[PDB]
Amino acid sequence: RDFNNLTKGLCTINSWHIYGKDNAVRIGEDSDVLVTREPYVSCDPDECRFYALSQGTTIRGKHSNGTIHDRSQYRALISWPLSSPPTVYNSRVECIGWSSTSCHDGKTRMSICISGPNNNASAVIWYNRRPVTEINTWARNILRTQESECVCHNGVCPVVFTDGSATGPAETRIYYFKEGKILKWEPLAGTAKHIEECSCYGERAEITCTCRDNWQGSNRPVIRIDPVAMTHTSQYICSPVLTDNPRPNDPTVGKCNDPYPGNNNNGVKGFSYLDGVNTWLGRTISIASRSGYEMLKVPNALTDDKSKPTQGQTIVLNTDWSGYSGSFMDYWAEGECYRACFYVELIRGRPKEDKVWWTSNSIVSMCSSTEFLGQWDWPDGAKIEYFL
Amino acid sequence: RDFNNLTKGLCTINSWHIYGKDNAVRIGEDSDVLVTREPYVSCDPDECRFYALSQGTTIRGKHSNGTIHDRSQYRALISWPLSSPPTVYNSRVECIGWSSTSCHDGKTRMSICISGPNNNASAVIWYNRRPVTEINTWARNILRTQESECVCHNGVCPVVFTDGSATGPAETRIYYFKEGKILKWEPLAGTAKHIEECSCYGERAEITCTCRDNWQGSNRPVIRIDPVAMTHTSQYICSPVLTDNPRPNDPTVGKCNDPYPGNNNNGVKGFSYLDGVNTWLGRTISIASRSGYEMLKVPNALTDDKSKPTQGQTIVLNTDWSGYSGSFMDYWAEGECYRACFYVELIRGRPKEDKVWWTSNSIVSMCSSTEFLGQWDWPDGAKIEYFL
Amino acid sequence: RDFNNLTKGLCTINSWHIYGKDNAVRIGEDSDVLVTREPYVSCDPDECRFYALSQGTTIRGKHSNGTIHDRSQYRALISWPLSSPPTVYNSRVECIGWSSTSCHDGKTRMSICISGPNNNASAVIWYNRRPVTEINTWARNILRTQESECVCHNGVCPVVFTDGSATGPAETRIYYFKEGKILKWEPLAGTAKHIEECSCYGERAEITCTCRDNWQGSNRPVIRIDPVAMTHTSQYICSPVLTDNPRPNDPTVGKCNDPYPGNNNNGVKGFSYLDGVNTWLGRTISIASRSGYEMLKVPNALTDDKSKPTQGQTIVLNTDWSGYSGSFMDYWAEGECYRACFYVELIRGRPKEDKVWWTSNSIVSMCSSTEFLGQWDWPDGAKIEYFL
Amino acid sequence: RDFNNLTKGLCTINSWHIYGKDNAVRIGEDSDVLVTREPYVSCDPDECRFYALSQGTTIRGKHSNGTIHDRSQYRALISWPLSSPPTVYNSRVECIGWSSTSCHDGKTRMSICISGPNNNASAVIWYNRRPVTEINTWARNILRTQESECVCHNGVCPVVFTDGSATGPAETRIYYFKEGKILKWEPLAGTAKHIEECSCYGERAEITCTCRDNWQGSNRPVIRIDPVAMTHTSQYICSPVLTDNPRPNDPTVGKCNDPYPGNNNNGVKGFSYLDGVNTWLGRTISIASRSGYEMLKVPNALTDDKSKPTQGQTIVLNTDWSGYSGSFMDYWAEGECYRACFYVELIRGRPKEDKVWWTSNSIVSMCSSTEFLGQWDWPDGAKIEYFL
């Protein structure tokens, strides 16, 4: 109909309720389920779907051997109905590539897929299911993007890209698209030292992205974008409650404008909802691996360098594998406020479970409730032994 | 379009004709069919669908081992086209949970799924395929609901929930929802001592639910609800024709306001159409197990404590397995009256057939006819030996 | 939109062109294809679909053992897209039963399925995908119907049913339905001695059905129906070109009002287009078994007892299996006339191919052309040896 | 809505970006994927789909043995969603045959399938999914057509057919269809000596087809059609950059009106975009087999007999198999010009990979970009060893 505008603020988050779960690996043991990774969720005005980068093979198929690798000519951004598994028969291909983002602006959906060799990659922007704009690599070192949904406001959908070294200073740009065309692009500004895989959401005409400093920070960089002025700034979450992985143990005081040191050249896509006292951070439970997952209410995490948790909810037990996590919201739901949601990728297979030769995942997603609901843990559920 | 109103009365039921049958287990022996249980049928203004709680695995898949268990993080309410089997590829997920109910109010559908640990469960009410309201457990002991469709009148859809002991007094509440929001809730009233798994239908602006007294009654409790005043009352079916299972043999006189004693702490979801002389009761043939199924016309069963059958129809022979049964009607069918329908869950596998490690079911459903049609028996049809 | 009216006459048939073919058995050797029999084709105003009675199991599934039997609780009328195979995932169930007919009246579709024991069967008439009317068996001996599409004119859709002995005089009735309700029914009139499995078509407000005399005739009975007056008459095709199977060899002169003797108690559903000189008969090539299939232009076959072929076209070689055949036409195609079409069931498995334990079929259908096209043979194509 | 008119010219082609890829053979190793060959892509006003001639069997099915053969009664033109693989469950059958073409005129789609014995074949033209016109073979020697999409302008869709010898002079005709009916047909004119498998596109009310001279030319014949006047002419691409296969090595000067000699009786369907300096030719890298694939910018290739490449892009490495290639464009995309696209069939199996008994393919397609994007190679990706 008309372009959507971020006119509401976030609802109060007192707990999280189960939204969707596909049980992909359990079902895939005996169904034609595609091997995937880097999943996310994104809504249209009339439907919310699951998205992920397919590996171009089923889990039980012999071509699943080697799916631990991130980039190949056989990957594609696919979407499928909420809570169904990604099957060969119900999946829709959005575009071909090994890195992506996608969002509905209210009238139609923009999907972006990046493909190519590490030194000669290119992004092609699709709008209304047709290719419209193409961008060639600027730093010649793995042009890459969000791996979760972008957000739009009055037709303008900013997207964060990074090109260059994953273990040093790189060239990050914020592109402002409207109907698939580039309106403008900026180099990263602010105090964030390295940006990767931004997870974003929007409220009251402002877009907040929580990203990943793969180089030196264990605290997460945050990019605030103004989609009307088409500007942005960046900093780190001040809180001592560290949310990257691997990471050091939590200190008593965090850092607001510098990476908090302790682990170098590694991390995991994650997210947060930063809204004053109504602030919730998500993180793996293990400081060493992508294991477990919890949500912690940390009032004023963004600006308070001594902020600690006042409430929490365990999503995945530390004895179960987790992985990437990102934010999304159904901007077209009825109501006075936007209900915060997120998904967690539950990775199975390599590298942790090496008895099988593949790497895949299932998804679990929750949304906020103003009630204080009881909690349950939501693991992948598959028994690796059945695949041997 | 507009909210549906229960403006008609029930058609005369002189017999039952076959409506739908999926042959799920026969087909599942060699197709990607999901393991299910607790099925039911529910109609929209333009389509009637099959519904059930999936176990998050196919029958032939290795994860089917252990599906005798009722609650896990891998269950979900799924719907699929009438008479098709519940396959991995044609099933739509309504919500995540191990107990549910769902109904169309005329404008859109409300689905409710309950999930969680036994002591910290929560129900989330979805309306128009988006979560809207959440209710946390009040007695901390398996919050649970109908396991069959709810009914609405002018936008108000009452739903019966029970929380607490399954073998003693528990806390049952009737919630009145409108567009997914709670308008009001009441504690159970009347003479019913224990309520579980209510099967409901509506006619002439009144909703009748036949439930299950798991604690002490072999006669069934009935809840009559007035969706305009938003009140209700409860009693037991007076008839000596006992319809729970397991149960004692039929006596000569029943009880109207007390459970009829003989079997404790057990039962089976069932239903009835209570309409003066046009009254039909459904029950398993066996008094000992979920075996066989018949429909008996018992004039004035609700109020006549000596009422006995004047006609009947066998649905499933006593040599074949049955299971849960519930009511539904297509409130949007053309005509002067509402045609009564019901479904029977045909359970296969554990605990009765222990050569296999799974438990699943297929469905058979019939609707009433004003004609006196010939009868046939409708068993599941699968040969367990083929799964060994 | 509005009820369709048979306002056109048949186009000139100078040859037949390939219309649809599903290759069901070839594909089913390694896909989830349902075992079927008694197929046909029927069109809606915007789509033509394949129809058949499913056996409630896939070909490769173990439950396919025994599918030679015609009646069970596991059969159902299913439809699927033109030229696709009948798979577990793309098939839609119209109704439950072991005998059927179905037709679109222009506004919506009526499907009729008969089920039950041999002595207590009943037909339930569905209209707009809801059950509307039910008819109980009148002679208590396998109530049965067309096994191909019915035809409607201004809302009235006559259907021919037979109940009683298959090897002696039986009770055949013509029911005139309108929006699923019975307007009237007549006992069979005319000179036909036994009626079964009528194949019908309509043109210029008249409906012609070519049926099967299972008792004593090798020539086919024809029923002409007037859907406005709601009357009919019957006779036999006069031509000496005999079209039932098994049958005697063709004589020099046929019979117009009596069965032509030679074979008793057996036959095969077949059809014909009777239109003066524009008359074409279809028949198996073999006089002994359901083997081969050809179309022969026999001018005035209906009324000329010495009429012989002036042209022909081989559809299936005598070295390949055929089976049932029936007529259908797309009454909603653009044009000045109705293009005649037909389908042939290509049966594989038992009883002729006894190395396998199942019986199934694939379909081939053609439509007429005013051109004189070259011919090709269209066999099922599967190699039975691959199923052993 | 209304008939589409070729009102735009081609966009500037500075490089090619990835458009779609199905990974059919990789996925088919463990999914119900149909064996195909002769694929192409064609768009409707709201969707672009993949098309191909099915072999009527899955790759893993036993009936795949022998799929190296081009013509049988089991082939059919099927279409399926962009970038999905051609599965038994998501494929739609357009028509039955072993040679085809298809195009949307703006209001609806015309599909043409040819079937029959080599000496008695016939084409049936379908329009709006109904058969409308039929054409019988005129030279009695494999009536055949494009094997890629046709193009329409104001309702007129020319299609090039060839009938007769594949290794000598044959009878090629250009048929001008409008709403499925023949408006007119012409014998081939101009200097092209032999025409087969034309790949066409349209811009500024002119249709250009690049075909294949199977008899004596290694340079490609070009047919220019005027769909308003309904006339055409033909010549050969002048350039010394030879694009058929097998072929001689490139000379220094080509031939404009004669086949360039060197290889007889063989070739491969191919295409080109001829637009002055904005001219790009596609060809296999190997001069000996259907191996590798590249696009070369050869300014004025059509008219300049000494024209050589000024830029290029490798699509498939010479160590990977290619096969047929053709043109298509989304004439309904937004924009000031038409974006040129093409697909390449990646054949696997026989005759080159003889360890398996089948022959199938996957597809890769690209579209032009005005940017100078980095290149990547896009091979089929399947490992034949997994099928043994």
Ligand SMILES: *[C@@H]1O[C@H](CO)[C@@H](O[C@@H]2O[C@H](CO)[C@@H](O[C@@H]3O[C@H](CO[C@H]4O[C@H](CO)[C@@H](O)[C@H](O)[C@@H]4O)[C@@H](O)[C@H](O[C@H]4O[C@H](CO)[C@@H](O)[C@H](O)[C@@H]4O[C@H]4O[C@H](CO)[C@@H](O)[C@H](O)[C@@H]4O[C@H]4O[C@H](CO)[C@@H](O)[C@H](O)[C@@H]4O)[C@@H]3O)[C@H](O)[C@H]2NC(C)=O)[C@H](O)[C@H]1NC(C)=O
């Ligand atoms: C039914 O359902 C309800 C609803 O879910 C259940 O109630 C919930 O129960 C939760 C489980 O306890 C509870 O969650 C915790 O909340 C704590 C906050 O509560 C207290 O908050 C303030 C401040 O303390 C108080 O004023 C208030 O009264 C509360 O007591 C959190 O602090 C908890 O998180 C911490 O503990 C968990 C482990 O239990 C850690 O995994 C988590 O990471 C937090 O601890 C680490 O981090 C902090 C801060 O840096 C450190 O101080 C601490 O040392 C830990 O650090 C180590 O570990 C981390 C992670 O590995 C590592 O990185 C670091 O380096 C260190 O090694 C927890 O989130 C819910 O709030 C509560 N909800 C409600 C509404 O009540 C109920 O139990 C269920 N019912 C039944 C019958 O089961």
Ligand SMILES: *[C@@H]1O[C@H](CO)[C@@H](O[C@@H]2O[C@H](CO)[C@@H](O[C@@H]3O[C@H](CO[C@H]4O[C@H](CO)[C@@H](O)[C@H](O)[C@@H]4O)[C@@H](O)[C@H](O[C@H]4O[C@H](CO)[C@@H](O)[C@H](O)[C@@H]4O[C@H]4O[C@H](CO)[C@@H](O)[C@H](O)[C@@H]4O[C@H]4O[C@H](CO)[C@@H](O)[C@H](O)[C@@H]4O)[C@@H]3O)[C@H](O)[C@H]2NC(C)=O)[C@H](O)[C@H]1NC(C)=O
């Ligand atoms: C073609 O189709 C038609 C249509 O289906 C067929 O006709 C139908 O045939 C049915 C089969 O007989 C018949 O159904 C029965 O109806 C009886 C009522 O009929 C009589 O009703 C009144 C009162 O008796 C008469 O006035 C009237 O004339 C009729 O005679 C029912 O009573 C039957 O139900 C009882 O029997 C069945 C077993 O046959 C039990 O399973 C059932 O539960 C009922 O009996 C138990 O319960 C009663 C009441 O408590 C007890 O009195 C009795 O002792 C039994 O109790 C034991 O068993 C139960 C269950 O296990 C257990 O809980 C308890 O503790 C005890 O152990 C039956 O329903 C249809 O009415 C009839 N339909 C029509 C329209 O005619 C026809 O046959 C078919 N044609 C052919 C050729 O086959």
Ligand SMILES: *[C@@H]1O[C@H](CO)[C@@H](O[C@@H]2O[C@H](CO)[C@@H](O[C@@H]3O[C@H](CO[C@H]4O[C@H](CO)[C@@H](O)[C@H](O)[C@@H]4O)[C@@H](O)[C@H](O[C@H]4O[C@H](CO)[C@@H](O)[C@H](O)[C@@H]4O[C@H]4O[C@H](CO)[C@@H](O)[C@H](O)[C@@H]4O[C@H]4O[C@H](CO)[C@@H](O)[C@H](O)[C@@H]4O)[C@@H]3O)[C@H](O)[C@H]2NC(C)=O)[C@H](O)[C@H]1NC(C)=O
């Ligand atoms: C390219 O394509 C074109 C188009 O398809 C091909 O041309 C077609 O070729 C067909 C094959 O010959 C031909 O079909 C035949 O037509 C005959 C009629 O043609 C003659 O008609 C009249 C009258 O004779 C002539 O005036 C006229 O000039 C023609 O000559 C039919 O008579 C043929 O049918 C009979 O033969 C076939 C076997 O060939 C039988 O299977 C069929 O059943 C008919 O014969 C039986 O029945 C008759 C009548 O009762 C008996 O008289 C006869 O003895 C047979 O009876 C025995 O067998 C039956 C069946 O088993 C059994 O029940 C009975 O008891 C007996 O045992 C045949 O239909 C097309 O007309 C022709 N089409 C056109 C437009 O030309 C062309 O060949 C192809 N090109 C190439 C290069 O291949």
Ligand SMILES: *[C@@H]1O[C@H](CO)[C@@H](O[C@@H]2O[C@H](CO)[C@@H](O[C@@H]3O[C@H](CO[C@H]4O[C@H](CO)[C@@H](O)[C@H](O)[C@@H]4O)[C@@H](O)[C@H](O[C@H]4O[C@H](CO)[C@@H](O)[C@H](O)[C@@H]4O[C@H]4O[C@H](CO)[C@@H](O)[C@H](O)[C@@H]4O[C@H]4O[C@H](CO)[C@@H](O)[C@H](O)[C@@H]4O)[C@@H]3O)[C@H](O)[C@H]2NC(C)=O)[C@H](O)[C@H]1NC(C)=O
């Ligand atoms: C990141 O991405 C970018 C974008 O893709 C990459 O840059 C591209 O790099 C390409 C790879 O080199 C390059 O493609 C080549 O372009 C040549 C034209 O460039 C020159 O053009 C003119 C004229 O020479 C110059 O004025 C200008 O400065 C350029 O130098 C083509 O000539 C190339 O094609 C020829 O070479 C390839 C093999 O490399 C052959 O396969 C191809 O067929 C051409 O050569 C055959 O045919 C010609 C003409 O007949 C013959 O002269 C020649 O002898 C060859 O003939 C033999 O082989 C053929 C085929 O087997 C056989 O039939 C015949 O009989 C003979 O046996 C090639 O197309 C892109 O233009 C360039 N793009 C851009 C925008 O720059 C970049 O590298 C990537 N970055 C990184 C870090 O990798």
Ligand SMILES: *[C@@H]1O[C@H](CO)[C@@H](O)[C@H](O)[C@H]1NC(C)=O
């Ligand atoms: C968003 O705001 C623009 C004006 O700024 C308006 O035209 C548009 O309709 C608004 N969107 C909606 C959904 O109201």
Ligand SMILES: *[C@@H]1O[C@H](CO)[C@@H](O)[C@H](O)[C@H]1NC(C)=O
């Ligand atoms: C997978 O591939 C590796 C490396 O190519 C090989 O050694 C291994 O055995 C393969 N695993 C399986 C199950 O085939």
Ligand SMILES: *[C@@H]1O[C@H](CO)[C@@H](O)[C@H](O)[C@H]1NC(C)=O
């Ligand atoms: C149900 O009744 C309400 C008024 O009470 C009315 O507004 C509504 O339209 C009625 N529903 C229908 C389907 O008529």
Ligand SMILES: *[C@@H]1O[C@H](CO)[C@@H](O)[C@H](O)[C@H]1NC(C)=O
């Ligand atoms: C199922 O699980 C049980 C208990 O975990 C195990 O003993 C049994 O063998 C399993 N059955 C099968 C068929 O694997």
Ligand SMILES: *[C@@H]1O[C@H](CO)[C@@H](O)[C@H](O)[C@H]1NC(C)=O
């Ligand atoms: C069929 O005829 C009836 C009148 O007899 C008419 O009302 C109806 O519209 C006609 N159908 C069509 C499709 O014109």
Ligand SMILES: *[C@@H]1O[C@H](CO)[C@@H](O)[C@H](O)[C@H]1NC(C)=O
């Ligand atoms: C099919 O069933 C028969 C009879 O029940 C049995 O003897 C036969 O072996 C079965 N065939 C197969 C392949 O199981």
Ligand SMILES: *[C@@H]1O[C@H](CO)[C@@H](O)[C@H](O)[C@H]1NC(C)=O
């Ligand atoms: C194509 O041109 C014809 C007139 O020549 C016009 O009627 C038609 O609408 C045009 N098509 C479009 C899409 O404008």
Ligand SMILES: *[C@@H]1O[C@H](CO)[C@@H](O)[C@H](O)[C@H]1NC(C)=O
């Ligand atoms: C395929 O068919 C050929 C020829 O009919 C036969 O020799 C060969 O063994 C078959 N291949 C396989 C794998 O069955």
Ligand SMILES: [Ca+2]
């Ligand atoms: Ca880090």
Ligand SMILES: [Ca+2]
């Ligand atoms: Ca009880």
Ligand SMILES: [Ca+2]
């Ligand atoms: Ca007969």
Ligand SMILES: [Ca+2]
């Ligand atoms: Ca050539």
